[PDB]
């Protein structure tokens, strides 16, 4: 994703875009690209199975 592209090219950009953009990129993509790396671990007895659906994650409003 990209905001107004002409930021830093027409005005002095805010001295926050490093941390802000890093956190937004993390929330947008790192969660997806790390949840997919979660395996399909299970038991050797062929009796149980655990699955983590990836394209269903969401966050909650802080209490």
């Amino acid at each position: 994703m990209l905001r107004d592209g002409n930021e830093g090219m027409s005005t002095i950009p805010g001295f926050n875009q490093i941390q802000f953009e890093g956190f937004w990129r993390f929330i947008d993509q790192g969660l997806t690209e790390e949840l997919s790396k979660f395996p399909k671990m299970e038991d050797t007895d062929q009796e149980i199975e655990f699955q983590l659906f990836v394209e269903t994650y969401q966050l909650a409003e802080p209490l």
Partner: protein
């Protein structure tokens, strides 16, 4: 109209006839490039690269008189 006694002052006067206006740009055409309809913070990028008719845009006659 003939009323005068002494000769005129050293710098010759200039006659400026027209309309008195504030920050007016008469010459307007269709510029090829536009820079966002809402964000005016980036419109200054059109002053580094003028549309070839607003390169040296003249204005009202009051501006010319003041500059003179």
């Amino acid at each position: 109209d003939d009323g005068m006694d002494f000769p005129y002052l050293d710098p010759p006067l200039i006659c400026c006839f027209g309309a008195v206006q504030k920050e007016f740009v008469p010459s307007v055409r269709v510029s090829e490039h536009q820079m966002d309809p809402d964000i005016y913070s980036g419109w200054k990028m059109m002053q580094w690269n003028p549309p070839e008719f607003g390169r040296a845009p003249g204005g009202p006659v009051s501006n010319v008189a003041i500059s003179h």
